[PDB]
Amino acid sequence: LRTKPDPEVEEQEKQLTTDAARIGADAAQKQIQSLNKMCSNLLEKISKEER
Amino acid sequence: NERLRALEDIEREIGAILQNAGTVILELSKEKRLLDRQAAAFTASVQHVEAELSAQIRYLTQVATGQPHEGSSYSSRKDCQMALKRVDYARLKLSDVARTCEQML
Amino acid sequence: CVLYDVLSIVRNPQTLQLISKKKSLAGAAQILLKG
């Protein structure tokens, strides 16, 4: 019983702690505005909009 | 062939790119090529497939109680095969007459 | 058992989430390709 011991994330981040310095860091954190709505404005205007 | 062609088209369009469109937003991995796939095959294909399915659903619904869409069920198609049998018997008789004629040589 | 035991006892440049999201996206793409 220790935080449900099954290391598969911390060990991976420690083994690959340095593989990208200034390559990206722009399409990972600022990628929440690329395609916001692509299917949310077409599901409520077919059957729900008729009634 | 109308209903057959409609079913064939529905089958060919059943496997739309909507199921494969789950890798379109990750195409922006070069700047903050094929980005057009995130527009035409994102939801419009699924919408069109659903519309076609709904249209196909609302048909005449002919079959109500018993056995409609019949059409053979009956007469001398049997006698057509019987006439083919008569043709075969005439063939056999002609062959026998030809054998008799050959023996007459 | 671990959850119940815990309940009864209670009474910088890592980017692990980014790697997890990348792995999830890769798995989703693989599932779509398999489908």
Coordinates of N, CA and C in Angstrom, one line a residue:
Chain A
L1 N 0.9 -1.2 0.0 CA 0.0 0.0 0.0 C 0.9 1.2 0.0
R2 N 1.2 1.7 -1.2 CA 1.9 3.0 -1.3 C 1.5 3.7 -2.6
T3 N 0.5 4.5 -2.6 CA -0.1 5.2 -3.7 C -0.3 4.3 -4.9
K4 N -0.8 3.1 -4.5 CA -1.0 2.0 -5.4 C 0.2 1.7 -6.3
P5 N 1.3 1.1 -5.8 CA 2.5 1.1 -6.5 C 2.4 0.4 -7.9
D6 N 2.6 1.2 -8.9 CA 2.6 0.7 -10.3 C 3.3 1.7 -11.2
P7 N 4.6 2.0 -10.9 CA 5.3 3.0 -11.6 C 5.3 2.9 -13.2
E8 N 4.6 3.7 -13.9 CA 4.6 3.8 -15.3 C 4.5 5.2 -15.9
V9 N 4.5 6.2 -15.0 CA 4.5 7.6 -15.4 C 5.7 8.3 -14.8
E10 N 5.9 8.2 -13.5 CA 7.0 8.9 -12.9 C 8.3 8.4 -13.4
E11 N 8.5 7.0 -13.5 CA 9.7 6.5 -14.0 C 9.9 6.8 -15.5
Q12 N 8.9 6.9 -16.3 CA 9.0 7.3 -17.7 C 9.4 8.8 -17.8
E13 N 8.8 9.6 -17.0 CA 9.2 11.0 -17.0 C 10.6 11.3 -16.5
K14 N 11.1 10.4 -15.6 CA 12.5 10.5 -15.1 C 13.5 9.9 -16.1
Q15 N 13.1 8.9 -16.9 CA 14.0 8.4 -17.9 C 14.0 9.2 -19.1
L16 N 12.9 10.0 -19.4 CA 12.9 10.9 -20.6 C 12.7 12.3 -20.1
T17 N 13.4 12.8 -19.1 CA 13.3 14.1 -18.6 C 13.9 15.2 -19.5
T18 N 14.7 14.8 -20.5 CA 15.3 15.8 -21.4 C 15.3 15.3 -22.8
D19 N 14.3 15.6 -23.6 CA 14.4 15.2 -25.0 C 13.9 16.3 -25.9
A20 N 13.5 17.5 -25.4 CA 13.0 18.6 -26.3 C 13.2 19.9 -25.5
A21 N 14.1 20.7 -25.9 CA 14.4 21.9 -25.2 C 13.6 23.1 -25.8
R22 N 13.8 23.4 -27.1 CA 13.1 24.6 -27.7 C 12.5 24.2 -29.1
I23 N 12.0 23.0 -29.2 CA 11.4 22.5 -30.4 C 9.9 22.9 -30.5
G24 N 9.2 22.4 -29.5 CA 7.8 22.8 -29.4 C 7.4 23.8 -28.4
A25 N 6.8 23.3 -27.3 CA 6.3 24.1 -26.2 C 5.4 25.2 -26.6
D26 N 4.8 25.1 -27.8 CA 3.8 26.0 -28.3 C 2.6 25.4 -28.8
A27 N 2.7 24.1 -29.3 CA 1.5 23.4 -29.8 C 1.1 22.3 -28.8
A28 N 1.6 22.5 -27.5 CA 1.2 21.5 -26.4 C 0.4 22.2 -25.4
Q29 N 0.8 23.4 -25.0 CA 0.0 24.2 -24.0 C -0.9 25.2 -24.6
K30 N -0.6 25.7 -25.8 CA -1.4 26.6 -26.5 C -2.2 26.0 -27.6
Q31 N -2.5 24.7 -27.5 CA -3.2 23.9 -28.4 C -4.7 23.7 -28.1
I32 N -5.2 24.6 -27.2 CA -6.6 24.5 -26.7 C -7.5 25.5 -27.5
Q33 N -7.0 26.1 -28.5 CA -7.7 27.1 -29.3 C -7.7 26.8 -30.8
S34 N -7.0 25.8 -31.2 CA -6.9 25.5 -32.6 C -8.2 25.1 -33.2
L35 N -8.9 24.1 -32.7 CA -10.2 23.7 -33.2 C -11.1 23.5 -32.0
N36 N -11.7 24.6 -31.6 CA -12.6 24.5 -30.4 C -13.9 23.8 -30.7
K37 N -14.7 24.3 -31.7 CA -16.0 23.7 -32.0 C -15.9 23.2 -33.4
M38 N -16.1 21.9 -33.6 CA -16.1 21.3 -34.9 C -17.3 20.4 -35.1
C39 N -17.9 19.9 -34.0 CA -19.1 19.1 -34.0 C -20.2 19.5 -33.0
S40 N -19.9 20.5 -32.2 CA -20.9 20.9 -31.1 C -22.0 21.8 -31.7
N41 N -21.8 22.4 -32.8 CA -22.8 23.3 -33.4 C -23.6 22.6 -34.5
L42 N -23.6 21.3 -34.6 CA -24.3 20.6 -35.7 C -25.1 19.4 -35.1
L43 N -25.1 19.2 -33.8 CA -25.9 18.1 -33.2 C -27.2 18.6 -32.6
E44 N -27.3 19.9 -32.3 CA -28.5 20.4 -31.6 C -29.3 21.2 -32.6
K45 N -29.1 21.1 -33.9 CA -29.8 21.8 -34.9 C -30.3 20.9 -36.0
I46 N -30.6 19.7 -35.6 CA -31.1 18.7 -36.6 C -32.4 18.1 -36.1
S47 N -32.4 17.6 -34.8 CA -33.6 17.0 -34.2 C -34.1 17.8 -33.0
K48 N -33.2 18.3 -32.2 CA -33.6 19.1 -31.0 C -34.2 20.4 -31.4
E49 N -33.7 21.0 -32.5 CA -34.2 22.3 -32.9 C -35.6 22.3 -33.5
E50 N -36.1 21.1 -33.9 CA -37.5 21.0 -34.4 C -38.5 21.1 -33.4
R51 N -38.2 20.9 -32.1 CA -39.2 20.9 -31.0 C -38.6 21.6 -29.8
Chain B
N1 N -33.9 -2.1 -59.6 CA -32.5 -1.9 -59.3 C -32.3 -0.6 -58.4
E2 N -33.4 0.1 -58.2 CA -33.4 1.3 -57.5 C -33.1 1.0 -56.0
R3 N -33.8 0.2 -55.4 CA -33.5 -0.2 -54.0 C -32.2 -0.9 -53.8
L4 N -31.8 -1.7 -54.8 CA -30.5 -2.4 -54.8 C -29.4 -1.4 -54.8
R5 N -29.5 -0.4 -55.8 CA -28.5 0.6 -55.9 C -28.4 1.5 -54.6
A6 N -29.6 1.8 -54.0 CA -29.6 2.6 -52.8 C -28.9 1.8 -51.6
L7 N -29.2 0.5 -51.5 CA -28.5 -0.3 -50.5 C -27.0 -0.4 -50.7
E8 N -26.6 -0.5 -52.0 CA -25.2 -0.5 -52.3 C -24.5 0.8 -51.9
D9 N -25.2 1.9 -52.2 CA -24.6 3.2 -51.9 C -24.5 3.4 -50.4
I10 N -25.6 2.9 -49.7 CA -25.6 3.0 -48.2 C -24.5 2.2 -47.6
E11 N -24.2 1.0 -48.2 CA -23.1 0.1 -47.7 C -21.8 0.8 -48.0
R12 N -21.6 1.3 -49.2 CA -20.3 1.9 -49.6 C -20.1 3.2 -48.7
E13 N -21.1 3.9 -48.3 CA -21.0 5.1 -47.5 C -21.1 4.8 -46.0
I14 N -21.3 3.5 -45.6 CA -21.4 3.2 -44.2 C -20.1 3.4 -43.5
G15 N -19.0 2.9 -44.1 CA -17.7 3.2 -43.5 C -17.1 4.5 -43.8
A16 N -17.7 5.6 -43.3 CA -17.3 6.9 -43.6 C -16.0 7.3 -42.9
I17 N -15.5 8.4 -43.2 CA -14.2 8.9 -42.6 C -14.4 9.5 -41.2
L18 N -15.7 9.6 -40.7 CA -15.9 10.1 -39.4 C -15.2 9.3 -38.3
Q19 N -15.2 7.9 -38.5 CA -14.5 7.1 -37.5 C -13.0 7.3 -37.6
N20 N -12.5 7.7 -38.8 CA -11.1 7.9 -38.9 C -10.7 9.4 -38.7
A21 N -11.7 10.3 -38.5 CA -11.4 11.7 -38.3 C -10.9 12.0 -37.0
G22 N -10.6 11.0 -36.1 CA -10.1 11.3 -34.8 C -8.6 11.6 -34.7
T23 N -8.0 11.9 -35.9 CA -6.6 12.3 -35.9 C -6.5 13.5 -36.9
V24 N -7.4 14.4 -36.7 CA -7.3 15.6 -37.6 C -6.9 16.8 -36.8
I25 N -7.2 16.9 -35.5 CA -6.7 18.1 -34.8 C -5.3 18.0 -34.5
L26 N -4.7 16.8 -34.5 CA -3.2 16.7 -34.3 C -2.4 17.0 -35.5
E27 N -3.0 17.4 -36.6 CA -2.3 17.7 -37.8 C -1.5 19.0 -37.7
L28 N -1.8 19.8 -36.7 CA -1.1 21.1 -36.5 C 0.2 20.9 -35.7
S29 N 1.1 20.0 -36.2 CA 2.4 19.7 -35.6 C 3.6 20.3 -36.3
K30 N 3.4 21.4 -37.0 CA 4.5 22.0 -37.7 C 4.6 23.6 -37.5
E31 N 3.5 24.2 -37.0 CA 3.5 25.7 -36.8 C 2.4 26.0 -35.9
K32 N 2.6 27.1 -35.1 CA 1.6 27.5 -34.1 C 0.6 28.5 -34.8
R33 N -0.4 20.5 -43.9 CA -0.6 20.0 -45.2 C -2.1 19.6 -45.4
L34 N -2.5 18.5 -44.9 CA -3.9 18.0 -45.1 C -4.8 18.4 -43.9
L35 N -4.8 19.7 -43.6 CA -5.7 20.2 -42.6 C -7.1 20.2 -43.0
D36 N -7.4 20.1 -44.3 CA -8.8 20.2 -44.8 C -9.6 19.0 -44.4
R37 N -9.0 17.9 -44.0 CA -9.7 16.7 -43.5 C -10.5 17.0 -42.2
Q38 N -10.1 18.0 -41.5 CA -10.8 18.3 -40.2 C -12.1 19.1 -40.5
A39 N -12.5 19.4 -41.7 CA -13.7 20.2 -42.0 C -14.7 19.3 -42.8
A40 N -14.3 18.7 -43.9 CA -15.3 18.0 -44.7 C -15.7 16.6 -44.1
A41 N -14.7 15.9 -43.5 CA -14.9 14.6 -43.0 C -15.0 14.5 -41.5
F42 N -15.2 15.7 -40.8 CA -15.2 15.7 -39.3 C -16.6 15.3 -38.9
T43 N -17.7 16.1 -39.3 CA -19.0 15.8 -38.9 C -20.0 15.9 -40.1
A44 N -19.7 16.5 -41.2 CA -20.6 16.6 -42.3 C -20.9 15.2 -43.0
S45 N -19.9 14.4 -43.1 CA -20.1 13.0 -43.6 C -21.0 12.2 -42.7
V46 N -20.8 12.3 -41.4 CA -21.7 11.6 -40.5 C -23.1 12.2 -40.5
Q47 N -23.3 13.5 -40.7 CA -24.6 14.1 -40.8 C -25.3 13.6 -42.0
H48 N -24.6 13.6 -43.2 CA -25.2 13.1 -44.4 C -25.5 11.6 -44.3
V49 N -24.7 10.8 -43.7 CA -25.0 9.4 -43.5 C -26.3 9.2 -42.7
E50 N -26.3 10.0 -41.6 CA -27.5 9.9 -40.7 C -28.8 10.3 -41.4
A51 N -28.7 11.4 -42.2 CA -29.8 11.9 -43.0 C -30.3 10.8 -44.0
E52 N -29.3 10.2 -44.7 CA -29.6 9.1 -45.6 C -30.3 7.9 -44.9
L53 N -29.8 7.6 -43.7 CA -30.4 6.5 -43.0 C -31.8 6.8 -42.5
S54 N -32.0 8.0 -42.1 CA -33.4 8.5 -41.7 C -34.3 8.4 -42.9
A55 N -33.8 8.9 -44.1 CA -34.7 8.8 -45.3 C -35.0 7.4 -45.6
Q56 N -34.0 6.5 -45.6 CA -34.3 5.1 -45.9 C -35.2 4.5 -44.9
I57 N -35.2 5.0 -43.7 CA -36.1 4.4 -42.6 C -37.5 4.7 -42.9
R58 N -37.8 6.0 -43.4 CA -39.2 6.4 -43.6 C -39.6 6.0 -45.0
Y59 N -39.7 4.7 -45.3 CA -40.2 4.2 -46.5 C -41.7 3.9 -46.4
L60 N -42.3 3.3 -47.5 CA -43.7 3.1 -47.6 C -44.2 2.1 -46.5
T61 N -43.3 1.2 -46.1 CA -43.6 0.1 -45.2 C -44.8 -0.8 -45.7
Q62 N -44.5 -1.4 -46.8 CA -45.6 -2.1 -47.5 C -46.0 -3.4 -46.7
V63 N -45.1 -4.2 -46.2 CA -45.4 -5.4 -45.5 C -46.1 -5.1 -44.2
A64 N -47.4 -5.5 -44.2 CA -48.2 -5.2 -43.0 C -48.6 -6.5 -42.3
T65 N -49.3 -7.4 -43.0 CA -49.9 -8.6 -42.3 C -49.3 -9.9 -42.8
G66 N -49.3 -10.1 -44.1 CA -49.0 -11.5 -44.7 C -47.7 -11.5 -45.5
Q67 N -47.9 -12.0 -46.8 CA -46.8 -12.2 -47.6 C -46.9 -11.4 -48.9
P68 N -46.4 -10.1 -48.9 CA -46.4 -9.3 -50.1 C -45.2 -9.5 -50.9
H69 N -45.0 -8.8 -52.0 CA -43.9 -8.9 -52.9 C -43.7 -10.2 -53.5
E70 N -44.9 -10.9 -53.8 CA -44.9 -12.1 -54.5 C -44.8 -11.9 -56.0
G71 N -45.1 -12.9 -56.8 CA -45.0 -12.7 -58.2 C -44.6 -13.8 -59.1
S72 N -44.2 -15.0 -58.5 CA -44.1 -16.2 -59.4 C -45.2 -17.1 -59.1
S73 N -45.2 -17.8 -57.9 CA -46.3 -18.2 -57.1 C -47.4 -19.0 -57.9
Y74 N -47.1 -19.4 -59.2 CA -48.2 -19.6 -60.1 C -47.8 -20.4 -61.3
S75 N -48.5 -20.2 -62.4 CA -48.7 -21.0 -63.6 C -47.5 -21.0 -64.5
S76 N -47.7 -21.1 -65.8 CA -47.0 -22.0 -66.8 C -45.5 -21.7 -66.9
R77 N -44.9 -21.0 -66.0 CA -43.4 -21.1 -65.8 C -43.1 -22.6 -65.7
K78 N -43.9 -23.3 -64.9 CA -43.8 -24.7 -64.8 C -44.0 -25.3 -66.2
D79 N -45.1 -24.9 -66.9 CA -45.3 -25.4 -68.3 C -44.3 -24.9 -69.3
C80 N -43.6 -23.8 -68.9 CA -42.4 -23.4 -69.8 C -41.3 -24.4 -69.7
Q81 N -41.0 -24.9 -68.4 CA -40.1 -25.9 -68.3 C -40.6 -27.2 -68.9
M82 N -41.9 -27.4 -68.9 CA -42.5 -28.6 -69.6 C -42.3 -28.5 -71.1
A83 N -42.4 -27.3 -71.6 CA -42.1 -27.2 -73.1 C -40.7 -27.4 -73.4
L84 N -39.8 -27.0 -72.5 CA -38.4 -27.3 -72.7 C -38.2 -28.8 -72.7
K85 N -38.9 -29.5 -71.8 CA -38.9 -31.0 -71.8 C -39.4 -31.6 -73.1
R86 N -40.5 -31.0 -73.7 CA -40.9 -31.4 -75.0 C -39.9 -31.2 -76.0
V87 N -39.2 -30.1 -76.0 CA -38.1 -29.9 -76.9 C -37.0 -30.9 -76.8
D88 N -36.7 -31.3 -75.5 CA -35.7 -32.4 -75.3 C -36.2 -33.7 -75.8
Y89 N -37.5 -34.0 -75.7 CA -38.0 -35.3 -76.2 C -38.0 -35.3 -77.7
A90 N -38.3 -34.1 -78.3 CA -38.2 -34.0 -79.8 C -36.8 -34.2 -80.2
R91 N -35.8 -33.7 -79.4 CA -34.4 -33.9 -79.7 C -34.0 -35.4 -79.7
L92 N -34.5 -36.1 -78.6 CA -34.3 -37.5 -78.5 C -34.9 -38.3 -79.7
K93 N -36.1 -37.9 -80.1 CA -36.8 -38.6 -81.2 C -36.0 -38.4 -82.5
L94 N -35.6 -37.1 -82.7 CA -34.8 -36.8 -83.9 C -33.5 -37.6 -83.9
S95 N -32.9 -37.7 -82.8 CA -31.7 -38.5 -82.7 C -31.9 -40.0 -83.0
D96 N -33.0 -40.5 -82.5 CA -33.4 -41.9 -82.9 C -33.7 -42.1 -84.4
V97 N -34.4 -41.1 -85.0 CA -34.6 -41.2 -86.4 C -33.3 -41.0 -87.2
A98 N -32.4 -40.2 -86.7 CA -31.1 -40.1 -87.4 C -30.3 -41.4 -87.3
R99 N -30.4 -42.0 -86.1 CA -29.7 -43.3 -86.0 C -30.3 -44.4 -86.9
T100 N -31.6 -44.4 -87.1 CA -32.3 -45.3 -88.0 C -31.9 -45.0 -89.4
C101 N -31.8 -43.7 -89.8 CA -31.4 -43.3 -91.1 C -30.0 -43.7 -91.4
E102 N -29.1 -43.5 -90.4 CA -27.7 -44.0 -90.6 C -27.6 -45.5 -90.8
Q103 N -28.4 -46.2 -90.0 CA -28.5 -47.7 -90.2 C -29.0 -48.0 -91.6
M104 N -29.9 -47.1 -92.1 CA -30.4 -47.3 -93.5 C -29.4 -47.1 -94.6
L105 N -28.2 -46.6 -94.3 CA -27.2 -46.4 -95.3 C -26.6 -47.7 -95.8
Chain C
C1 N -9.0 -2.7 -1.1 CA -8.5 -2.8 0.3 C -7.6 -1.6 0.6
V2 N -6.8 -1.2 -0.4 CA -5.9 -0.1 -0.2 C -6.7 1.2 0.0
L3 N -7.8 1.4 -0.8 CA -8.7 2.5 -0.6 C -9.3 2.6 0.7
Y4 N -9.9 1.4 1.2 CA -10.5 1.3 2.5 C -9.5 1.6 3.6
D5 N -8.3 1.1 3.5 CA -7.3 1.3 4.5 C -6.9 2.8 4.6
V6 N -6.8 3.4 3.4 CA -6.4 4.9 3.4 C -7.6 5.7 4.0
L7 N -8.8 5.3 3.7 CA -10.0 6.0 4.2 C -10.1 5.9 5.7
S8 N -9.8 4.6 6.2 CA -9.9 4.4 7.7 C -8.7 5.1 8.4
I9 N -7.6 5.2 7.7 CA -6.4 5.9 8.4 C -6.6 7.4 8.4
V10 N -7.2 7.9 7.3 CA -7.5 9.4 7.2 C -8.5 9.8 8.3
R11 N -9.4 8.9 8.7 CA -10.4 9.3 9.7 C -9.9 9.2 11.1
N12 N 9.4 20.8 -12.3 CA 9.5 21.9 -13.3 C 9.4 21.4 -14.7
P13 N 10.5 21.0 -15.3 CA 10.4 20.5 -16.7 C 10.1 19.0 -16.7
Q14 N 9.0 18.6 -16.1 CA 8.6 17.1 -16.1 C 7.7 16.9 -17.2
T15 N 6.6 17.6 -17.3 CA 5.6 17.5 -18.3 C 5.1 16.1 -18.5
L16 N 4.7 15.5 -17.3 CA 4.2 14.1 -17.3 C 2.8 14.1 -18.0
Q17 N 2.0 15.1 -17.7 CA 0.6 15.2 -18.3 C 0.7 15.3 -19.8
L18 N 1.8 16.0 -20.3 CA 1.9 16.1 -21.8 C 2.2 14.8 -22.4
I19 N 3.1 14.0 -21.8 CA 3.5 12.7 -22.3 C 2.3 11.8 -22.2
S20 N 1.5 11.9 -21.2 CA 0.3 11.1 -21.0 C -0.8 11.4 -22.1
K21 N -0.9 12.7 -22.4 CA -1.8 13.1 -23.5 C -1.3 12.7 -24.8
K22 N 0.0 12.7 -25.1 CA 0.5 12.2 -26.3 C 0.3 10.7 -26.5
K23 N 0.5 10.0 -25.4 CA 0.2 8.5 -25.4 C -1.2 8.2 -25.7
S24 N -2.1 9.0 -25.1 CA -3.6 8.8 -25.3 C -3.9 9.1 -26.7
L25 N -3.4 10.2 -27.3 CA -3.6 10.5 -28.7 C -3.1 9.4 -29.6
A26 N -1.9 8.9 -29.3 CA -1.4 7.8 -30.1 C -2.3 6.6 -30.1
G27 N -2.8 6.3 -28.9 CA -3.7 5.1 -28.7 C -5.0 5.3 -29.4
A28 N -5.5 6.5 -29.4 CA -6.8 6.8 -30.1 C -6.5 6.7 -31.6
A29 N -5.4 7.2 -32.1 CA -5.1 7.1 -33.6 C -4.9 5.6 -34.0
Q30 N -4.3 4.8 -33.1 CA -4.1 3.4 -33.4 C -5.5 2.7 -33.4
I31 N -6.4 3.0 -32.5 CA -7.7 2.4 -32.4 C -8.5 2.8 -33.7
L32 N -8.4 4.0 -34.1 CA -9.1 4.4 -35.3 C -8.5 3.7 -36.5
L33 N -7.2 3.5 -36.6 CA -6.6 2.8 -37.7 C -7.0 1.3 -37.7
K34 N -7.1 0.7 -36.5 CA -7.5 -0.7 -36.4 C -9.0 -0.8 -36.8
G35 N -9.8 0.1 -36.5 CA -11.2 0.1 -36.9 C -11.4 0.3 -38.4

